[PDB]
Amino acid sequence: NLRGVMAALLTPFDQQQALDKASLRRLVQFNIQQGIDGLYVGGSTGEAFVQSLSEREQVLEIVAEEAKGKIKLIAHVGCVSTAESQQLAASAKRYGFDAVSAVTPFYYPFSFEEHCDHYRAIIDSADGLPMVVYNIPALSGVKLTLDQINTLVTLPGVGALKQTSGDLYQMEQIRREHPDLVLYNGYDEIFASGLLAGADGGIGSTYNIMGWRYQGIVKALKEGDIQTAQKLQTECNKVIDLLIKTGIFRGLKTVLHYMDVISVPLCRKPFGPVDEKYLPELKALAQQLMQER
Amino acid sequence: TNLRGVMAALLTPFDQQQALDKASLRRLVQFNIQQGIDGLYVGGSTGEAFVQSLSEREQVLEIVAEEAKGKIKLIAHVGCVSTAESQQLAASAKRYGFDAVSAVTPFYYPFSFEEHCDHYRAIIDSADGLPMVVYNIPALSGVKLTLDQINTLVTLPGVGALKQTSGDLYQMEQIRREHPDLVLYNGYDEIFASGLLAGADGGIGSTYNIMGWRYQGIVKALKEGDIQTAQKLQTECNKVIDLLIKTGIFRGLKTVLHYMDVISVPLCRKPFGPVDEKYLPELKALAQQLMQER
Amino acid sequence: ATNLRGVMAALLTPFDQQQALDKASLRRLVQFNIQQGIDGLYVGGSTGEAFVQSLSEREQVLEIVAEEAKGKIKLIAHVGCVSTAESQQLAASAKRYGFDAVSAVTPFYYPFSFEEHCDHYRAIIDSADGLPMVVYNIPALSGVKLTLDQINTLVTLPGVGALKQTSGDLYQMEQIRREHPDLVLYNGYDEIFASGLLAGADGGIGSTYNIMGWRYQGIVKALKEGDIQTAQKLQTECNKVIDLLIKTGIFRGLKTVLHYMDVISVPLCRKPFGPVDEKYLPELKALAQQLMQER
Amino acid sequence: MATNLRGVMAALLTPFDQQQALDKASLRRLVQFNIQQGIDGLYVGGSTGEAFVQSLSEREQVLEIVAEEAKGKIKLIAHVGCVSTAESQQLAASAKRYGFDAVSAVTPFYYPFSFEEHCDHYRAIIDSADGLPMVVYNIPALSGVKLTLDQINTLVTLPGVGALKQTSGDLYQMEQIRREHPDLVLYNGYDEIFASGLLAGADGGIGSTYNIMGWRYQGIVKALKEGDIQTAQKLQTECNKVIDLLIKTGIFRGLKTVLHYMDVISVPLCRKPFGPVDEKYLPELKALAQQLMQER
């Protein structure tokens, strides 16, 4: 079962921008400790697009060693290249992941038929692991229609869709057309509204520091406690407001650093460092979250 | 009281010659009232106001007032590209006894934010006391405002509400967070339930004309913490919206209302075309379903 | 000329302090344009602030311009409104006043289907009673993004004799010319006039022609004679001016310059358009001086 | 002449074999083919070279081979851009080692980088280019990065920047850029508006279609220089008839197919996810190849 609240894992680096293995292991354990349902590895949040294939594989392997069998593991193996995506998919299979995922190939304009074959090829290489189609027009530049999304999610081997779109009319339409589809809400800031529209779970970057709040919104809605659902979403958004200002990945890494999880809060260039003017708020947030749970 | 609630964006019934069909207009107003609607938003996109003359828009306002003033809330959309024309309609809305005025951000020409602000100020002045409902509808106006700009507009002297026709529910929540007492109408019918959850405390929509009770049902369900009921009602509304988008929204609605014996002739004004005959069977069945459901 | 090809100024509508039409200034502006050697005038479009004018006000302007320039220069009446019926009324008036052609921007705000757009133009053409139609493509303001195939269909509708192309896509400009060798094709963005002509346009309609139309005529001539350098220098000068007008606000900036040239009495635009920022007056006054001396 | 970057330069394609591996023989043939048709230089490792579906070592291999074939004969610009600054720096250092005349980098994409981050990205690559001029690459349609004129002005005035490849159809901006930077080497990026782009201010161009008909673009440069507008328009029109076709067939694969028919490329395949050319287009592509060979 792939339904649930899963954190989009960050990739800790050292001062020289190389993978910080110890911090990666610590972050995985930190997520498991807070009760996350699983981890989405190698996606935007893992800074996969500023990493080489071997580096992405290294992360996948380490995460599997740390969490396989404890929580669900989804490997984002997407690359612009189909061959590269297939290589990562085969590795994900070898490491024991529960599923693979791929963002619609970007930069170059590809036809819908080319997108479909891309997924089929990756699904083939995943050798049994279900595919999680990844729709994120804001970053990919690929704007799929409802009909195209319907076609992609019905491809043999596809078991879920990570929907990083704020269009909740489309979210409802997808649920209506696919009653049993695992549908992850992608934008943390509309989690509550996304679940109401039809999503049955979610994958997000901020889950790394406050995943319990999202689990709290799932519970609240399940119990009909709209008031609690809204309060939690509001608090999540006050945090997201900040992270968008500071830079999301580096902001999250900085909070995790103050929580003593990540040794060095750096992102790889061209991502710049956090503006020191935000440190007071990030430190205060880390303190608040540590007390909260 | 206040301006919070579920308000139908009123359609303007026309006769075979595209002239205002007063009799049908009156029937539609009473039809909405009987559905339990909290009020009416008159003279906006749905009333085909932008293909009407000022005199025609005033006529519709006056008649609606005659029919519903004192029974339900009445919001007059007096927006035009021209500030002066908007002001004329604002003055008339006051004269007819409306509860508030509203204006879409002036379109076509690219206006600076300062110009938009002065535009609203001028209309509020002519509204002579009636509160202003700012109207944000980027998809149709082409005006894309930032959160900061929206915050500035809703805090202008005389503004009492915002009709938010935007699918960005992060921004909906941000608006609610920054303005806890603001009357916030969800504009897109298809995300009503989620819009309320995000922070909207009511809504204004075109489809309320034929199934307003469903939207009232969503408000009640969420109020009682009945998530499943809210979702089921929204799903049903969306099945209808799916159809209306295919047939053309205004003409599809008028056609359903015709089959409900509310409107005599279901046509819209040119350039709007007639409904494709292949959709009539579905629209008739819908009309029957809604009537039996209600 | 027995055709509609040429350089036509998009006429501004002079208003008095009360925002009411300044007839005297309108007449002076029409005569000023004729004296500049303009080939014609495009009346009642964006530049005439038609969309913040009532139907009768737009008609009044059409009547006055006709009185002033009918038979002297070509006259194109932009009768476009969102409403088809309203557009038809202006088309009938344009015909009665003796205009050479009518024009209509793709109806905006509401999302109309392409078939609805086609019927819209057909209806207006009918009311134009013989006057050729100039389809007006201006996606930036209208929000209507037509495909090449849709544009081809529109320009070939019975009664259509030209296209005002306010688009910076010069690949599409060339494709239109390639598909329609004899089509009258007006370049809409003044800032790329020279390149637009090179791509296939055989004329142009623009707001800045009101204060320096001879420069655009000079560009046409320069290209006709193979004088690339002159065409570029002229376009560069026009763009230095356009840079300023975009900062000051185009219509009010143009009107202010015209006021300094003693053409327009009150350089005001109708609300929501605001007044020019006084900090720009020195540059606008200097520009007016430069243009007058340049003549 | 020794260091002048102005001119008409082809965006080089990367020939692959049936297994999607680099076809060295065809790559060398393509470089020679371009030199033979009088091209001023080559832009290597950009969008057209399918660099974004190639590894760093594969991109370096192409750079090295092209240098062996053309260094000293024509100008060589190495597009070393990657989303990653570090990878871009590696390619920049290799470009210098191989003897390229300049480096170039597309604005990093996918992630929404701030303008300051873009600036530091270019500065870092410029440092690694150690002397080779940088060609800023603005291509919003593919990168999704929409820069303002002020931002472009800031980028092209960074120390070490000697040119800008402007893949934008906004010819007002093209003129503004030329007006603000009279000495800036400015390459028109969209082949379909080459003539108008030069008229607006560009002093040269870089394009994918130059691989099969570069002499036409050189013809347009000459035509405009001589004040022969009719000839310039005629050539642009013929180029656009071809571009109309390539957009329908798929640009890179359509070009490779024509080059295959011209006996330059052994296998006209692009790397997945790019699909093969639809056979219904072969008649026009073969006829085009024949026409171009007749013309050349």
User: Which DSSP category does C131 fall into?
Assistant: P
Q: Rounded CA gap, B217 and D112, in Å? A: 41
CA dist D180 → D152, D183, D283, D293 (Å):
11, 9, 47, 41
Rg, chain D, Cα only: 18
What subunits touch chain C, counting only 3 or more CB pairs under 8 A?
A: B, D
Nearest to B29 by CA among B9, B14, B59, B5: B9
Catalytic residue, from B163, B185, B215, B254: name it. B163
CA dist D49 → D22, D59, D226, D267 (Å):
11, 9, 33, 15
Concerning whether C164 is annotated as a catalytic residue, the answer is: yes
Residues 6+ apart with CB under 8 A from D275: A111, A113, A114, A117, D250, D253
CA dist C98 → C71, C128, C158, D144 (Å):
9, 11, 21, 49
Nearest to C51 by CA among C23, C22, C13: C13
| Residue carrying the six token digits 């025609």 | B56
In this structure, the number of other CB atoms found within 10 A of the CB of residue C32 comes to 20
- Residue A3: phi, psi to the nearest 5? -70, 140
Beta carbons of B198 and A221 less than 8 Å apart: no
CA dist D126 → C146, D133, D203 (Å):
42, 8, 23
- Helix D282-295 / helix D210-225 crossing angle, nearest 10 deg: 50
Catalytic residue, from C42, C74, C121, C164: name it. C164
- Closest partner residue to D120 (CB to CB) among A53, A84, A270 is A270
Distance separating the N- and C-terminal Cα atoms of chain C? 25
Instruction: Please check whether residue A112 is in contact with residue A81, taking contact to mean a CB–CB distance below 8 angstroms.
Output: no
| Residue carrying the six token digits 């509310």 | B262
Q: Rounded CA gap, B103 and B108, in Å? A: 15
Residues 6+ apart with CB under 8 A from C47: C10, C11, C12, C207, C251
Residues 6+ apart with CB under 8 A from B227: A196, A221, A222, A224, A226, B221
Looking from the CA of A207 toward its CB, the CA atoms found within 13 Å total 34
Instruction: Please check whether residue B198 is in contact with residue B169, taking contact to mean a CB–CB distance below 8 angstroms.
Output: yes
Beta carbons of A139 and D110 less than 8 Å apart: yes
**Residue of chain B with shortest Cα separation from C138:** B108
In this structure, the number of other CB atoms found within 10 A of the CB of residue D287 comes to 11
Which residues on neighbouring strands pair with residue D75, listed in sequence order? D41
Q: Rounded CA gap, C217 and B228, in Å? A: 69
C39 touches chain D (CB under 8 A): no
Nearest to A209 by CA among A252, A248, A264: A252
Concerning whether D165 is annotated as a catalytic residue, the answer is: yes
DSSP sequence for C197-214: HHHT--EEEETTHHHHHH
Residues from chain C that touch D237, judged by Cβ atoms under 8 A, are: 174, 178
How would you classify residue B213: left for phi > 0, otherwise alpha for psi between -120 and 50, otherwise beta?
alpha
Instruction: Please check whether residue D174 is in contact with residue D202, taking contact to mean a CB–CB distance below 8 angstroms.
Output: yes
Catalytic residue, from D137, D187, D210, D217: name it. D137
Residues from chain C that touch B108, judged by Cβ atoms under 8 A, are: 46, 51, 108-109, 141-142
Q: Rounded CA gap, A182 and A133, in Å? A: 11
Q: Rounded CA gap, C41 and C8, in Å? A: 5
C181 touches chain D (CB under 8 A): no
Beta carbons of C82 and B110 less than 8 Å apart: no
Q: Residue B251 has which token pair?
A: 């003409």
Instruction: Please check whether residue D272 is in contact with residue D30, taking contact to mean a CB–CB distance below 8 angstroms.
Output: no
Residues 6+ apart with CB under 8 A from D229: C198, C223, C226, C228, D223
Q: Which domains does chain A have, with CATH numbers?
A: 1-293 (3.20.20.70)
Instruction: Please check whether residue D255 is in contact with residue D209, taking contact to mean a CB–CB distance below 8 angstroms.
Output: yes
Catalytic residue, from A40, A119, A134, A184: name it. A134
Instruction: Please check whether residue D194 is in contact with residue D216, taking contact to mean a CB–CB distance below 8 angstroms.
Output: no
Q: Residue C170 has which token pair?
A: 């010069």
Residues from chain C that touch B78, judged by Cβ atoms under 8 A, are: none
Print the SS3 string covering A246-285: HCHHHHHHHHHHHCCCCCCCCCCCCCCCCCHHHHHHHHHH
CA dist B188 → A189, A199, B212, C203, D4 (Å):
19, 19, 14, 44, 57
Q: How far is C143 from chain B (nearest CA, A)?
A: 7
Instruction: Please check whether residue C202 is in contact with residue C162, taking contact to mean a CB–CB distance below 8 angstroms.
Output: no
Instruction: Please check whether residue B7 is in contact with residue B73, taking contact to mean a CB–CB distance below 8 angstroms.
Output: yes
- Closest partner residue to B270 (CB to CB) among C54, C85, C273 is C85
| Residues D111, D117, D120, D125, Cα dihedral to 10° | 10
Residues 6+ apart with CB under 8 A from C128: C79, C91, C92, C94, C95, C102, C159
Q: Residue C48 has which token pair?
A: 């005439």
Q: Rounded CA gap, B20 and B28, in Å? A: 13
| Residue carrying the six token digits 């002397």 | D131
Beta carbons of D272 and A139 less than 8 Å apart: no
Which of A174, A195, A226 to mutate to probe the B interface, most B CBs <10 Å? A226
Question: Is C191 assigned to a binding site?
Answer: yes
User: Which DSSP category does D132 fall into?
Assistant: P
Q: Rounded CA gap, B211 and B276, in Å? A: 22
What sign does the dihedral A16-A22-A26-A28 (CA atoms) show? positive
Beta carbons of D109 and A110 less than 8 Å apart: no
Task: Evaluate whether chains B and A are touching (3 or more beta carbon pairs less than 8 Å apart).
Answer: yes
Beta carbons of C198 and D197 less than 8 Å apart: no
Q: In terms of C-beta distances under 8 Å and separation of at least 24 residues, what long-range contacts does B111-118 make, across chains too?
A: B111/B143, B111/C272, B111/C273, B112/C249, B112/C274, B113/B145, B113/B149, B113/B152, B114/C274, B115/C272, B115/C273, B115/C274, B116/B143, B116/B149, B116/B153, B116/C272, B117/B152, B117/B153, B117/B156, B118/B83, B118/C271, B118/C272, B118/C274
What sign does the dihedral A64-A68-A70-A73 (CA atoms) show? positive
Residues 6+ apart with CB under 8 A from D222: none
Number of helices (H), then strands (E), in chain A: 12, 8
In sequence order, what E strands does B22-82 have? 39-42, 73-77
Q: How far is C155 from chain B (nearest CA, A)?
A: 18
Residues from chain D that touch C168, judged by Cβ atoms under 8 A, are: 169-172
Experimental method: X-ray
B110 touches chain C (CB under 8 A): yes
Q: Rounded CA gap, B63 and D262, in Å? A: 76
Residues 6+ apart with CB under 8 A from A134: A43, A76, A78, A101, A102, A103, A104, A161, A162, A164
Residues 184-203 of C with CB under 8 A from D: 189, 191-192, 194-196, 198-200
Residue type, D124: A
Q: Rounded CA gap, A59 and A91, in Å? A: 11
Q: Where are the alpha helices (DSSP H) in D13-135?
A: 24-36, 56-70, 85-98, 115-129
Beta carbons of D171 and C174 less than 8 Å apart: no
Q: How far is B15 from chain C (nearest CA, A)?
A: 15
- E strand or H helix at B185: strand B183-186
In sequence order, what E strands does chain D have? 8-11, 41-44, 75-79, 102-106, 134-138, 161-166, 185-188, 204-207
Q: Rounded CA gap, D259 and D279, in Å? A: 16
Q: Residue B241 has which token pair?
A: 């919206």
Q: Rounded CA gap, A194 and A208, in Å? A: 19
Q: Rounded CA gap, C6 and C12, in Å? A: 19
Task: Evaluate whether chains C and D are touching (3 or more beta carbon pairs less than 8 Å apart).
Answer: yes
Instruction: Please check whether residue C287 is in contact with residue C253, taking contact to mean a CB–CB distance below 8 angstroms.
Output: no
CB pairs under 8 A between A and D: 95
- Could you list the residues of A known to form a binding site, using ranges: 44-45, 164, 186, 188-189, 205
Rg, chain B, Cα only: 18
Question: Is C129 assigned to a binding site?
Answer: no
Q: Rounded CA gap, B223 and B225, in Å? A: 5
Residues from chain B that touch A240, judged by Cβ atoms under 8 A, are: 170
Q: Rounded CA gap, A136 and A103, in Å? A: 7
Q: Residue C199 has which token pair?
A: 């791509």
Q: Rounded CA gap, A222 and B226, in Å? A: 10
Q: Rounded CA gap, C212 and C194, in Å? A: 15
- Residue C151: phi, psi to the nearest 5? -65, -40
A44 touches chain D (CB under 8 A): yes
Residues from chain C that touch B269, judged by Cβ atoms under 8 A, are: 83-85
C226 touches chain D (CB under 8 A): yes
Task: Evaluate whether chains C and B are touching (3 or more beta carbon pairs less than 8 Å apart).
Answer: yes
C18 touches chain B (CB under 8 A): no
DSSP sequence for C222-266: HHHTT-HHHHHHHHHHHHHHHHHHHHH-HHHHHHHHHHHTTS-S-
How far is C-alpha C111 from the chain's CA centre? Answer: 24
D145 touches chain A (CB under 8 A): no
